Amino acid sequence: SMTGLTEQEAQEFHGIFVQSMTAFFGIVVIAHILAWLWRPWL
Amino acid sequence: SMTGLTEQEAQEFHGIFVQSMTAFFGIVVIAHILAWLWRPWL
Amino acid sequence: SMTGLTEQEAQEFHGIFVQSMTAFFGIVVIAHILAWLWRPWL
Amino acid sequence: SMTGLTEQEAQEFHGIFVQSMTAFFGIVVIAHILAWLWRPWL
Amino acid sequence: SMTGLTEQEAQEFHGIFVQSMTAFFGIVVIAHILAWLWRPWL
Amino acid sequence: SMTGLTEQEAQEFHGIFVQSMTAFFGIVVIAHILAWLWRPWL
Amino acid sequence: SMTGLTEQEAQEFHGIFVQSMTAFFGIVVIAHILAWLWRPWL
Amino acid sequence: SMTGLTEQEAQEFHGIFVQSMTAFFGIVVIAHILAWLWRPWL
Amino acid sequence: SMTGLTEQEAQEFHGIFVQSMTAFFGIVVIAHILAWLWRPWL
Amino acid sequence: SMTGLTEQEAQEFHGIFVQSMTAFFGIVVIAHILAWLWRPWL
Amino acid sequence: SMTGLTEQEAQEFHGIFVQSMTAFFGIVVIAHILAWLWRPWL
Amino acid sequence: SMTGLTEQEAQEFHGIFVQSMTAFFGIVVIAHILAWLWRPWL
Amino acid sequence: SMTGLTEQEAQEFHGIFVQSMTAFFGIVVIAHILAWLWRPWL
Amino acid sequence: SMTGLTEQEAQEFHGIFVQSMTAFFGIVVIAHILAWLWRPWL
Amino acid sequence: MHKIWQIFDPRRTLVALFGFLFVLGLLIHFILLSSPAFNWLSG
Amino acid sequence: MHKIWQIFDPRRTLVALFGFLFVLGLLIHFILLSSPAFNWLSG
Amino acid sequence: MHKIWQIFDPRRTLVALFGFLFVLGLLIHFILLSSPAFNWLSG
Amino acid sequence: MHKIWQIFDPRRTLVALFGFLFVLGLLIHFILLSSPAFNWLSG
Amino acid sequence: MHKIWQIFDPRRTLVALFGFLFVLGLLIHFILLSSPAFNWLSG
Amino acid sequence: MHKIWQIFDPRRTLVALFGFLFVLGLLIHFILLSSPAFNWLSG
Amino acid sequence: MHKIWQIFDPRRTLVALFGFLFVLGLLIHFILLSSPAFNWLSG
Amino acid sequence: MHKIWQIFDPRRTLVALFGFLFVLGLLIHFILLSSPAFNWLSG
Amino acid sequence: MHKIWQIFDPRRTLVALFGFLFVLGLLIHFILLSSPAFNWLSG
Amino acid sequence: MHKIWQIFDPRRTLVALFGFLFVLGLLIHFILLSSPAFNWLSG
Amino acid sequence: MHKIWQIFDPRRTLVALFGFLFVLGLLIHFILLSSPAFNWLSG
Amino acid sequence: MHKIWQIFDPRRTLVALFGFLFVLGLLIHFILLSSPAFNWLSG
Amino acid sequence: MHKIWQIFDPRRTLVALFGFLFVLGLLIHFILLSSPAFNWLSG
Amino acid sequence: MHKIWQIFDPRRTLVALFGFLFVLGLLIHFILLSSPAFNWLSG
Ligand code: BCL
Ligand code: BCL
Ligand code: BCL
Ligand code: BCL
Ligand code: BCL
Ligand code: BCL
Ligand code: BCL
Ligand code: BCL
Ligand code: BCL
Ligand SMILES: COC(C)(C)C\C=C/C(C)=C/C=C/C(C)=C/C=C/C(C)=C/C=C/C=C(C)/C=C/C=C(C)/C=C/C=C(C)/C=C/CC(C)(C)OC
């Protein structure tokens, strides 16, 4: 609409983006659980 | 009117913008409640 | 007259501007009443 | 004369300018009276 | 003669300029009398 | 799609990229195991 | 001769320049007499 | 594909690059063995 | 000869220049005599 | 291939380059032997 | 020859230059005699 | 070949260059022998 | 040859240059003799 | 060869250059003999 | 009073106003933090 | 006196006036904060 | 209120808003780290 | 004396005059604040 | 929500996101190193 | 003596003269403030 | 997941990745040298 | 001796001369202020 | 794996590699000189 | 010896000479002021 | 191995090589001068 | 020996020579002023 | 070996060579002046 | 040996030679002034 991507190219990029972000957040959550097990900060 | 969007593209962007802002503010409110239960500042 | 807005577009912008500024000032007044209840400065 | 405004556009702007400046000066005078009742400086 | 103004525009500007400068100087004189009654410096 | 590579050139680069990154991560993991046997940090 | 003024415009300017400078010097002389009566420096 | 080299010029460059890098790494390994016999750091 | 002035314009400027410089030097001499009567420096 | 030299010019430059580098390295080796007999560093 | 002056314009400038420089040097010599009478430095 | 000199101009320059460098090195060697008889550094 | 002066303009400049340099060096020599009679430095 | 001088303009310059450099070196040698007679540094 | 929007651009004015208001809020909050009597983050 | 608007641009004059007034208010408030007798944020 | 998107560019606004919100979060977290009463990384 | 307005521009002159007058007032007020005998904000 | 990719470039956004995430991770790791209670490299 | 106005621009000369006179007055007033015997704002 | 190479240049990405990895390795090695408990070159 | 005006511009010679004379007067007055024996503003 | 030479220029890559290797060797040699235990030029 | 004016511009030679002479006189007067034995403004 | 001369220029390469070799020799000689055990000019 | 003036520009040579001679005289006079044994302005 | 002159400009090589040789001689002479054991101008 | 003047320009070479010789003489004289044993201006 403004960059050049159609709604099918945007839905193709959005799905992979959400999957990658979810994997990143899962790794982050596991790391933070390990950190809390190591040294709780609250 | 000034940037190029019509009333339908501006109402479509406004709805998603308001939903995202509401989700952001809800997460912020939960975080601030947790912070107050952690360390009240007033 | 000087920027490009007609009188109807300026009256349309002025109403929304005044409503937004009034909401902002109401929130500001509530916050300042709360601050006076917390720590009066005069 | 030199900017582009006629005597009617300049008189239209001058009236609103003087009204706004008078309102500003009235608010300023009230604030200064309040400040004098708070802490006189002379 | 040099900047573009005629003798009627220069006399029209000169009268208003002199009136404004006289008002400014009168306000200044009143302020300086008040200052002298507040704290003489000589 | 955006740079110029087709999906066959992107799948050819992706395979070699993933193999190289996997080899790099395996060397990194071996080095980190050796470092842990040398000086554990947790 | 060098700037553009004729000798009638230069003599028109010179008379006003001399009158203004003489008034300035008279005010300066009065101020310096007042200063000497206030605090002589020699 | 991207810089201009063909597969035969790249395979010709890759072989010499790998041979030179292997010789460099062998010299580095001998130097590091000599350093360990001189002053072990672990 | 080099700037554009003729010998009559240069002699007209030279006379006024010499008169002005002589007046300046006379004022300077009077001031220096007054300074010597005030505080001799040699 | 990339600069402009043919292989006959590159081979004939390579021989002189290698001879000069070998002479340089031999002089360096003699100097380093002399330095070791003067002050061993290991 | 190199700047634009002829031999008659150069001789005209040279005579006045030498006269002015001689007057300057005479004033300098008188000043230096007065200075030596005031405070000899050798 | 690369700068513009032929094989005879380069050979002509090389002979004089080598002779000059040999003279420079002979002077350097004599100076260094003198310096060693003055203050040996090894 | 390189600047533009002929052999007659270069010989005419050279004679005056040498005369001026000789006069300068004679004045310098007299000054240095006077300085040695004032304060010898060797 | 590179600048523009022929073999005759370079031999004419070389002779004068060598004569001037020889005179400079002779003056330098006399000065250094005088300096050694004044304060030997070795 | 609406005629100001025919003199002042509705958007450059609005962006400048929002920026100045944000900077003003930052400044006032930083001033109250520098004052010990009104610093709410100590205690 | 209205003819000043045929000499001075209504918008650039007005923007400059608003900016100078804001800077003047900031300056006066800061000066009163730097004066112990008129600092209202101490105590 | 949606008409603001006909005045403000949806993407440049979003970029500026996200940048200012990130800088604001960084600033608030750094201010709370500089306050001993609210530093959670000490202890 | 009005002919000065045929030499000097009514607007640039006037802007410069207002600017120098404002800077002069600021300077005089700041000088009196730097003088203990005439500082009105102490006490 | 995918329509953000019609407003924001998939690559410039993605490069900026990766760079900001890397700088944020560096900042958080450095802040935890500056805190003695959470420095894992001392001991 | 009026011929100077055919050599010197009546306006640039006049602006320069006014500026130099103002700076000279400021300098003289500042020199007297720096001299304790002639400082009128002390006491 | 390979489609990222249709969004990102295999060579500028790869050069940037190698440079960031090298700088990261240098930084981590320097940080372990600044920590006495993990400095391997002392002793 | 008048021929100097055929060599030097009556206006730039004159402006430069006035400027150098003013700077010279300022310098001489400042030097006499820096000398206690000739400072007339002390006492 | 050879196809990297169709993405990366053999010469600029090679110059960059040689420069980085030289700077890395200088850095490692300077780090070992700064460490008393591994300085070989002392004693 | 007059031929120097065919090599050297009279106006630039006069300007440079006058400037150098003025700077030389200033330098000599300043050096004597820095000389206690030859300072005429002390006493 | 000679093919490197079809990738690298015999002259720029050679100039760079000579420059880096000279700077390396300077560096090594300065380092040995900064080491008291290997300074040959002390004594 | 005169042929040097077919090689050197007389005016640029003369200007450079005069400037270097003036700077040399200044340097020598300043060096002798900095030497107490040859300072003629002390005493 | 003469063919280096077909690669290296006979004149920028001799100029650079002469300049580097002069700088090297200056460096070596200055290093011996900074070494007390080899300073020939002390004593 | 004269062929150097077909390679080296006489004027630029000669100017550079004279400048370097002058700077070298200045440097050598300044070094002897910095050495107490060879300073001829003390005593
Ligand atoms: C403080 C006590 C703990 C510790 C607990 C924490 C906690 C808790 C977390 C980390 C996280 C990380 N820690 Mg830590 N960490 C410690 C000490 C270390 C030290 C060290 C020298 O000791 C190192 C170098 C690391 C390194 C890391 C990284 C693996 C990771 C941050 C990467 C990032 O910013 O991606 C962000 C940048 C990107 C570009 C990500 C993009 C992702 C996309 C989908 C993939 C594209 C490739 C991309 C270019 C790189 C991806 C890298 C991976 C996502 C890691 N930690 C110690 C001992 N650390 C975090 C993590 O797990 O994140 C994954 C995390 O939650
Ligand atoms: C001070 C005591 C508390 C604490 C209480 C507070 C409180 C109270 C709050 C936070 C908030 C945040 N805290 Mg904190 N926080 C603490 C310590 C930490 C530490 C740490 C190293 O210990 C980390 C790294 C964080 C990190 C964060 C982020 C998760 C979040 C701010 C994100 C932001 O600025 O979005 C702003 C920028 C954007 C671009 C948001 C845009 C949103 C849109 C809809 C989504 C688009 C994606 C966008 C690019 C990124 C979205 C990120 C998420 C919204 C978080 N906190 C401790 C222990 N913190 C706040 C929060 O919850 O925000 C959500 C919040 O209210
Ligand atoms: C000092 C004792 C009090 C306190 C009392 C005060 C008082 C009193 C006030 C605030 C106000 C604010 N305080 Mg506070 N505040 C405290 C501590 C904090 C801390 C903290 C880390 O503890 C935070 C981050 C804040 C944050 C804030 C903001 C919510 C708000 C200023 C926003 C602004 O400048 O908009 C200005 C910029 C704009 C662009 C506004 C534009 C409005 C339009 C209509 C909406 C468009 C969206 C726009 C882009 C963003 C709108 C934001 C909201 C209007 C807030 N306060 C404490 C504990 N604070 C003020 C407020 O309520 O303002 C609403 C206010 O009156
Ligand atoms: C020192 C002891 C006194 C004091 C005695 C003095 C004396 C004495 C005088 C002032 C004057 C002023 N004082 Mg005070 N003043 C004090 C402390 C203050 C403090 C403070 C925080 O305490 C404030 C903010 C002021 C502010 C002022 C201004 C109202 C005024 C200078 C305005 C100016 O420069 O216009 C100059 C710039 C212009 C552009 C003016 C142009 C005029 C034209 C005709 C109108 C066009 C509008 C123009 C843009 C703005 C007009 C402003 C008004 C003319 C003021 N005073 C105290 C307590 N002050 C002076 C004054 O009254 O001036 C009118 C004055 O004579
Ligand atoms: C702290 C206690 C340990 C130690 C434990 C750690 C741990 C744990 C690790 C290292 C890692 C490394 N250490 Mg260490 N390390 C120590 C001391 C040293 C010293 C030294 C002066 O003593 C040096 C020279 C090194 C050097 C190294 C490198 C070999 C490597 C980081 C390379 C890199 O960043 O690639 C990143 C940049 C790239 C461009 C990689 C790209 C990879 C692709 C596939 C190949 C292309 C070629 C590319 C240009 C270069 C490849 C290099 C290799 C992958 C190494 N270590 C000590 C004694 N070190 C890490 C490693 O093994 O990495 C492989 C690692 O995990
Ligand atoms: C040191 C002890 C004495 C003192 C003794 C000296 C002596 C002795 C002399 C001065 C001179 C001057 N002194 Mg004093 N002076 C003292 C203290 C002061 C103080 C002060 C704050 O107390 C000031 C304001 C001055 C100011 C002045 C000026 C009136 C004058 C330098 C003007 C100039 O440089 O023109 C130079 C620049 C020009 C442009 C002149 C050009 C002339 C042409 C023909 C006219 C064109 C108009 C031109 C633009 C301005 C003309 C100004 C007048 C010529 C003065 N004196 C004290 C108390 N002073 C000198 C003087 O009288 O000069 C006339 C002078 O000889
Ligand atoms: C530290 C204790 C020792 C000492 C032992 C070491 C050791 C060990 C070595 C040197 C080496 C050198 N030492 Mg040492 N050295 C000492 C003190 C000195 C002092 C001094 C004033 O005290 C001087 C000036 C030198 C100078 C030198 C150079 C002769 C040489 C490095 C030149 C170079 O970098 O070429 C590199 C740059 C080039 C451009 C070379 C290019 C070669 C090509 C084929 C020829 C083209 C001409 C080229 C432009 C210049 C050639 C120069 C020669 C090859 C030297 N040494 C002392 C007393 N030194 C090294 C050497 O012998 O190198 C040959 C060496 O191995
Ligand atoms: C150190 C103890 C002595 C002393 C002994 C020395 C000795 C010894 C010498 C000087 C020389 C000079 N000294 Mg001394 N000198 C002393 C103190 C001073 C003081 C002072 C404030 O006390 C002054 C200002 C001077 C000034 C001078 C100059 C007259 C002259 C250097 C001019 C020059 O550099 O021309 C160089 C620049 C030029 C451009 C010259 C060009 C010549 C051509 C032919 C003429 C063209 C005109 C040209 C533009 C200017 C000519 C100026 C004259 C040649 C002087 N001396 C004391 C008391 N001085 C030297 C001299 O006599 O030079 C002539 C000299 O030999
Ligand atoms: C240290 C104890 C001695 C001393 C012993 C040394 C020794 C030893 C020497 C000098 C030399 C010089 N000394 Mg000494 N010198 C002393 C103190 C001084 C003092 C001082 C303030 O006391 C000064 C002004 C000088 C000045 C000089 C110069 C005359 C000369 C360096 C000129 C030069 O660099 O040309 C180089 C630059 C050029 C451009 C030369 C070019 C030559 C061509 C052929 C001519 C063209 C004209 C050219 C532009 C200028 C020629 C100048 C003359 C050649 C001098 N000496 C004391 C008291 N001095 C040297 C000398 O005699 O050189 C001739 C020399 O050997
Ligand atoms: C076009 O080609 C034709 C057709 C003409 C054929 C010709 C081909 C030719 C002539 C090819 C020639 C090829 C050559 C000469 C190749 C040479 C290759 C070499 C020497 C490769 C070497 C590689 C070395 C590498 C990649 C080393 C990497 C090291 C790393 C990344 C180290 C990192 C260290 C880190 C980050 C951390 C720790 C270090 C410390 C502790 C210091 O940090 C503080």
Numbering used by the authors:
A (entry chain T), B (entry chain R), C (entry chain P), D (entry chain N), E (entry chain L), F (entry chain V), ...: 6 to 47
O (entry chain Q), P (entry chain O), Q (entry chain S), R (entry chain M), S (entry chain U), T (entry chain K), ...: 1 to 43
Q: What is the paper's account of this structure, in its own sentences?
A:
The genome of the mildly thermophilic hot spring purple sulfur bacterium, Allochromatium (Alc.) tepidum, contains a multigene pufBA family that encodes a series of α- and β-polypeptides, collectively forming a heterogeneous light-harvesting 1 (LH1) complex. Here, we use the purple bacterium Rhodospirillum rubrum strain H2 as a host to express Ca2+-bound and Ca2+-free Alc. tepidum LH1-only complexes composed of α- and β-polypeptides that either contain or lack the calcium-binding motif WxxDxI; purified preparations of each complex were then used to test how Ca2+ affects their thermostability and spectral features. The overall structures of these two complexes were similar—both were circular assemblies of 14 αβ-heterodimer subunits, two pairs fewer than the more elliptical-shaped native Alc. tepidum LH1−RC complex; as such, the circular topology of these LH1-only complexes would not be able to accommodate the RC. In both complexes, each αβ-heterodimer subunit bound two molecules of BChl a and one carotenoid.
Thus, LH1-α1β1 and LH1-α2β1 were used as models of the Ca2+-bound and Ca2+-free complexes, respectively, and their cryo-EM structures were determined at resolutions of 2.45 and 2.78 Å, respectively. By contrast, in the Ca2+-free LH1-α2β1 complex, the regions corresponding to Ca2+-binding sites remained empty, consistent with the Ca2+ binding pattern in the native Alc. tepidum LH1−RC, further validating the authenticity of the Ca2+-binding motif WxxDxI. However, the overall structures of both LH1 (α1β1) and LH1 (α2β1) complexes are still quite similar, with the main difference residing at the C-terminal region due to the longer sequence of α1 compared with α2. The Qy transition of the LH1-α1β1 and LH1-α1β3 complex (both containing the Ca2+-binding motif) occurred at 894 nm, whereas the Qy of the LH1-α2β1 complex lacking a Ca2+-binding motif was at 888 nm. In contrast to the Ca2+-bound complexes, and as expected, Qy absorption of Ca2+-free complexes was entirely impervious to the influence of calcium ions, EDTA, or alternative metal ions. The spectrum of the Ca2+-free LH1-α2β1 complex was similar to that of the native LH1−RC, while both the intensity and peaks of carotenoid absorption in Ca2+-bound LH1-only complexes differed. In the Ca2+-free LH1-α2β1, the major carotenoid was spirilloxanthin (C42), as is true of the native Alc. tepidum LH1-RC complex. For the Ca2+-free LH1-α2β1 complex, the denaturing temperature was markedly decreased to 73.4 °C, slightly lower than the native LH1−RC complex. Tepidum, where a mixture of 14- and 15-subunit LH1-only complexes were detected, all Alc. tepidum LH1-only complexes contained 14 subunits. It is noteworthy that among the three Alc. tepidum complexes constructed, the thermal stability of both Ca2+-bound complexes was comparable and distinctly better than that of the Ca2+-free complex, further confirming that enhanced thermal stability of the complex arises primarily from bound Ca2+.
